[PDB]
From a paper:
The [name]/Nei superfamily (also called H2TH superfamily) includes bi-functional enzymes able to remove a wide variety of oxidized bases. The enzyme architecture consists in two globular domains connected by a flexible hinge: (i) a N-terminal domain rich in β-structures containing a highly conserved N-terminal α-helix (αA) displaying generally a proline (P1) at the N-terminal involved in catalysis and (ii) a C-terminal domain rich in α-structures containing both DNA binding domains of the enzyme (the H2TH motif and a β-hairpin domain structured in most cases as a Zinc finger). All these enzymes feature AP lyase activity consisting in the successive cleavage at the 3’ and then at the 5’ sides of the abasic (AP) site according to β,δ-elimination. In this work, we deciphered at the atomic level the structural and/or functional determinants required for the specific inhibition of ZnF [name]/Nei DNA glycosylases by the uncompetitive inhibitor 2TX.
Four [name] variants were constructed: W179A, R247G, [name] and C268H. To evaluate the 2TX sensitivity of R247G and [name], we used the PAR assay. In contrast, the variant [name] appears about two times less sensitive to 2TX than the wild type. This result is in perfect agreement with the crystal structure of [WT/Bz]-2TX showing that C268 is another reactive target for 2TX and with the observation that hNEIL2 containing CHC2 type of ZnF is also inhibited by 2TX.
Numbering used by the authors: 1 to 272
DNA sequence: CTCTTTTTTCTCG
DNA sequence: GCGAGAAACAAAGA
C-alpha cells in the first residue's frame, strides 16, 4: 500500500478496535517483529488499544499510554478482522486476539514489519528515517520543497519515492502525480522551474487527498481492510500501457523502467 | 527449466 | 556522498 491505502486501513481500524483489550498475541512468523516477538507479546498482552495513527506509509497503534506499535505493510501486507474461530490462511503471520474477534496480519512476501517503541520515542523514530512532511497544504511547505529540488541532480521520480521530500508516494501515485503535473519521471530536479514545482506540489496534495477520499486503490477486492477502494477507477496512467492518454491527443501511455521501477507516462504531456 | 514482474534497505565501485 | 543494482520473499506469467 501507499499512503491513501494505509490511511483507509487506519480509519477502519480506528472504528473497530479502539477500546479493545488485547487478550493474547500469537505469531507463526515472529521474525517480522523487529524489536522481538516475545518482548512485544509480554508488553502488549492485556493492554487496551487507545488509538490508531499514521505517519507516511506507517501505521501506529497506540496501546496503553506508553507503547506504540509501528507497522509497515510494505508491498503486500493486509490486515483483516475475523471471528475467533476463523481458519488460518497460508500467509497469515500474526494475530492480536480480542475477546470477540481477532486482528490478523498477512503478507505473502513477508516484507512487512512490526516494531514496538515507547511513546516518547515515536518522533525520534521518524526523524531517524528522515521521513518528509505529510502531503497536506498545512505540513508540505512548497518553499523548502523548491529549495531541495534546486540543490539536487536526482531524477524526480526516484527522489519523490525516497519519502524525504514528502511522505507517502509509491509507484502508483508518483506516476499519477507526474502525469497530472506534466513532468517526465527522469527530469533532473534542478532543471524544474518554479511554476512546474508549484504544479507538482499542489498535484501531490490533490492526488493523495482524492485517493484518501475514495478509499484508496484496490486492484482487487479482498477479505481485508481497505479493499473497498474506488481510486483504481480514477487512475490515468498507472497500469494503462498502450491505452490513450485521457487528455485526448491520441498518444498511448508508455511504460519504461526508471531506477528499477515500472514507470507509466504520456510522452506528449511529459516531455523530458 | 529461466527470466521478469509486483517498499525499504543493502552492496559495491 | 552518488547511482545502479540487488535483496529480503512469494507467486504468477512469458
Ligand atoms: Zn498526454
Amino acid at each position: 500500500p501507499e499512503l491513501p491505502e494505509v490511511e483507509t486501513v487506519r480509519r477502519e481500524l480506528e472504528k473497530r478496535i479502539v477500546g479493545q483489550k488485547i487478550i493474547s498475541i500469537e505469531a507463526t512468523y515472529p521474525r517480522m517483529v523487529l524489536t522481538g516477538f516475545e518482548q512485544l507479546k509480554k508488553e502488549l498482552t492485556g493492554k487496551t488499544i487507545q488509538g490508531i495513527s499514521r505517519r507516511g506509509k506507517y501505521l501506529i497503534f497506540e496501546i496503553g499510554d506508553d507503547f506504540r506499535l509501528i507497522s509497515h505493510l510494505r508491498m503486500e501486507g493486509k490486515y483483516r478482522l475475523a471471528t475467533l474461530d476463523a481458519p488460518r490462511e497460508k500467509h497469515d503471520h500474526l494475530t492480536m486476539k480480542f475477546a470477540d474477534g481477532q486482528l490478523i496480519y498477512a503478507d505473502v512476501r513477508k516484507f512487512g514489519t512490526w516494531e514496538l517503541i515507547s511513546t516518547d520515542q515515536v518522533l525520534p523514530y521518524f526523524l531517524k528515517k528522515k521521513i518528509g512532511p505529510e502531503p497536506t497544504y498545512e505540513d508540505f511547505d512548497e518553499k523548502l520543497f523548491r529549495e531541495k529540488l534546486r540543490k539536487s541532480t536526482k531524477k524526480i521520480k526516484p527522489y519523490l519515492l525516497e519519502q524525504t521530500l514528502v511522505a507517502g508516494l509509491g509507484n502508483i501515485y508518483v506516476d499519477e502525480v507526474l502525469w497530472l503535473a506534466k513532468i517526465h519521471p527522469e527530469k533532473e530536479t534542478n532543471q524544474l522551474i518554479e511554476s512546474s514545482i508549484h504544479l507538482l506540489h499542489d498535484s501531490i496534495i490533490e492526488i493523495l487527498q482524492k485517493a484518501i477520499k475514495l478509499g484508496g486503490s484496490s486492484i482487487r477486492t479482498y477479505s481485508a481492510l481497505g479493499s473497498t477502494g474506488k481510486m483504481q477507477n480514477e487512475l490515468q496512467v498507472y497500469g494503462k500501457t498502450g491505452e490513450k492518454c485521457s487528455r485526448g491527443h491520441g498518444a498511448e501511455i508508455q511504460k519504461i523502467k526508471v531506477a528499477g521501477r515500472g514507470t507509466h507516462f504520456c510522452p506528449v504531456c511529459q516531455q523530458k
